[PDB]
Each structure stands twice: as structure tokens, then as C-alpha cells.
Amino acid sequence: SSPIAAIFDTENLEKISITEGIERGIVDSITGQRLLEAQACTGGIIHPTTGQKLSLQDAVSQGVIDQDMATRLKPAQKAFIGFKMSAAEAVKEKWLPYEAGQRFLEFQYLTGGLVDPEVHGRISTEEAIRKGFIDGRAAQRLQDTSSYAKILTCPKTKLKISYKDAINRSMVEDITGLRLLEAASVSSK
Amino acid sequence: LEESSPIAAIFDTENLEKISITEGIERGIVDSITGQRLLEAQACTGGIIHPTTGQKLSLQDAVSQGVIDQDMATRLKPAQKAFIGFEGVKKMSAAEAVKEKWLPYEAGQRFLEFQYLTGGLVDPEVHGRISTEEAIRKGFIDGRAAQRLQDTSSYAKILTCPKTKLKISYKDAINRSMVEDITGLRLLEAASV
């Protein structure tokens, strides 16, 4: 699946970047950062309208994310370009908290499979196991997308949801092909 | 296999058909305690598994859909809590609940094993599964408890295998289960005696 690219501000019926969603207060800062991390660790920050995958520096330049966010996303981008080492390895080497490494791997798994920084390519879970990125247990966890940590506050319902839930709830924009997550100022629940 | 999806339902060998655990109990091919435990394994891992759709259900919805009966839903509350979390007194995970005597050791242990065998212990905080390393980090279990979970071969035989009627562990159940072709749902065979 494609990563969630941007936010759909239901109340204002318009697509906005995750950053704007945060600015508007309809996507909390943590959730927003995590959505952005999901982009960085899977190829790059997604321009909300062009769909172009961007490096953090270009994202900042294009106004897709601000400098502070760019800073906080460094580990996420490295989960893609390498720390080269992968997020799983960074967690092992005490460079990245488990929580972070786990979501990065889930972000990658849900979007095509774990990323192997060394080749930019994705790899099968069998290969990730072989590479030591994950063990069979982690593989079963990853494959069981229904049990992913509810690390996001659904911007619309305000309930805790996983990134798989987010993808499930996301809608695709008219052929930009971009996956949008609806957001509201207050819970729709 | 060391880990796998939770057993979802029963394959009634005599009738060559998949039925819910509840139905297995009803037809007397799965005893109520074993059936309850198979259901606990589902409840503590996210939800009662709908036998046909595979969707995870709250106990309430499972009762509403006839997937489990009212009395069973009552008996499954602790297992569901093993997933959603035990009221803080900051929700407690199953392991913590055992420590605070809120959950009998046996029930807690069953739940931890069910989770472990199906991907990893559940962190009620984020309602997701975590590596054992992380569970240790969170203080859910210490190395000793982690070692116990790892030795799946030594899990208590808490189930009566629906087919052989012999006592087996959940690990055994998963190893003796069959994956239903189209659905990917894990079934345990059951026969009458």
C-alpha cells in the first residue's frame, strides 16, 4: 500500500499537508509526526499535491514540513536511506527506541515490506529474518497487521488507531493517487 | 512452528465442516473449558474470532453474533482484559495483573502464552503486540518469566485436544491445527467419542 500522503480536513473540505493538519490543530503533533515518519521511512516525505517523494531538506524547502519537524524526522528518513544500517539494527545498537523502530518497520511492512537501506529496495519478511532485522516472532507480529500498536490518534474519530487502521480508513484522492486521512477539529465519535 | 495466528475455529471431522468453538462445545465435541480457553486465546489477542469472516470481535459483539453465548462472554472478561488492559490501579497488562493478584496466576499465564504464541505479548497501553525484549523493557515480565514463555515446549497442557481428547498446550494446538484453504483461518479438528 502507499503511505498516507496527506490530510483531508473534513470541516473545510480540503486536502492539506500533515504539517498543516498539525498547524490547524486537527492532527495532533505526535500523530502528525508519525504519519510523516511513515513517509520518510518508506521513500521520503510526500508532497501533499504533487505526490513527489522528498528528502527532509527538500521537504523543508518546499514547505511540506518545518525545520523542527525535519529534525525530529531524521531517524525516520534514515530508516530509509540508512543510519548503511536499518531501523531494526539501529534499535539493536541502541540508536533508536524500540517503539520507533517498531513503527518504522510496520510503516515499511504495510507499504511493500521492510526496507534494506543498503539497496533502497524492499525485502521479503523471510529475507528480513535472514538479515537479522526481525525474528520469526517479529515476523508473525508484522504479518498480523490487526495487532499493530494503536500509535496514532485518528484525526477524525480521535480514537487510537494503528497505521494499518489509518490505511484502512484512508481515502484515495482523485488520481493524485494520494492516500488521505480525514481529520476533524473534534471527535466524529 | 513457534508462532502463528490464534486458532480461529473448529473443524468438525464427523460433519466435515468448520464450526465456531462455541458450536463445538454445543455439539459436545469440544469441552467447555477447552473451548473457553480457545476463546480466551482470541479475546486476549484482540478479539473473539468470527469463524467465517475472521474479524476480531469484542465479547459483546461476539455474543450479539452468536459466536459465543452469554455465560461464556462472562467467563472471557479477564481474557479480554488481558488485551484491553486491567484498570490502571495506566492500564495493567496481564503479567502485571497477576502480580497485583487481580488475575489468578493460571489465567494470567494462559493469556501471556496465548499472546506469546501468536506474535508476542500485548501492551494494553497501545493495544499492540511487542517483542519479549520490549515486554522486559516495560517491566511486564523479567528474564525468568520471559524464559518460561520461550520454553513453549513446557507450557501446561491446558487444553483437551478436541480430536484425540488428550491434554495439550496451546502451542500443541497450533501445531495440530490446519489452515483453512481460502480464509487462512486456523482450525482445530474435533470429533465425538
From Swiss-Prot, chain A:
Species of the source: Homo sapiens (Human)
Family the entry assigns: Belongs to the plakin or cytolinker family.
Plectin repeat positions: 1-32, 33-70, 102-139, 140-177
Free-text tissue specificity from the UniProt record: Expressed in oral mucosa (at protein level). Expressed in arrector pili muscle (at protein level). Expressed in the heart in the heart (at protein level).
Subunit structure: Homodimer. Interacts with COL17A1 (via cytoplasmic region). Interacts with DSC2. Interacts with PKP2. Interacts with PKP1. Interacts weakly with TMEM65.
Domains as described in the record: The N-terminal region is required for localization to the desmosomal plaque and interacts with the N-terminal region of PKP1.
Disease named in the record: Keratoderma, palmoplantar, striate 2: A dermatological disorder characterized by thickening of the skin on the palms (linear pattern) and the soles (island-like pattern) and flexor aspect of the fingers. Abnormalities of the nails, the teeth and the hair are rarely present. Cardiomyopathy, dilated, with woolly hair and keratoderma: An autosomal recessive cardiocutaneous syndrome characterized by a generalized striate keratoderma particularly affecting the palmoplantar epidermis, woolly hair, and dilated left ventricular cardiomyopathy.
Gene transcribed to yield this protein: DSP
Residues annotated with Phosphoserine modification: 188
Subcellular location: Cell junction, Desmosome; Cell membrane; Cytoplasm
Superkingdom, taxonomy of origin: Eukaryota
Renumbered residue ranges of the record's region 4.5 X 38 AA tandem repeats (Domain C): 1-189
Entry function: Major high molecular weight protein of desmosomes. Regulates profibrotic gene expression in cardiomyocytes via activation of the MAPK14/p38 MAPK signaling cascade and increase in TGFB1 protein abundance.
Entire-sequence positions represented here: 2616 to 2811 of 2871
Name of the protein this chain belongs to: Desmoplakin
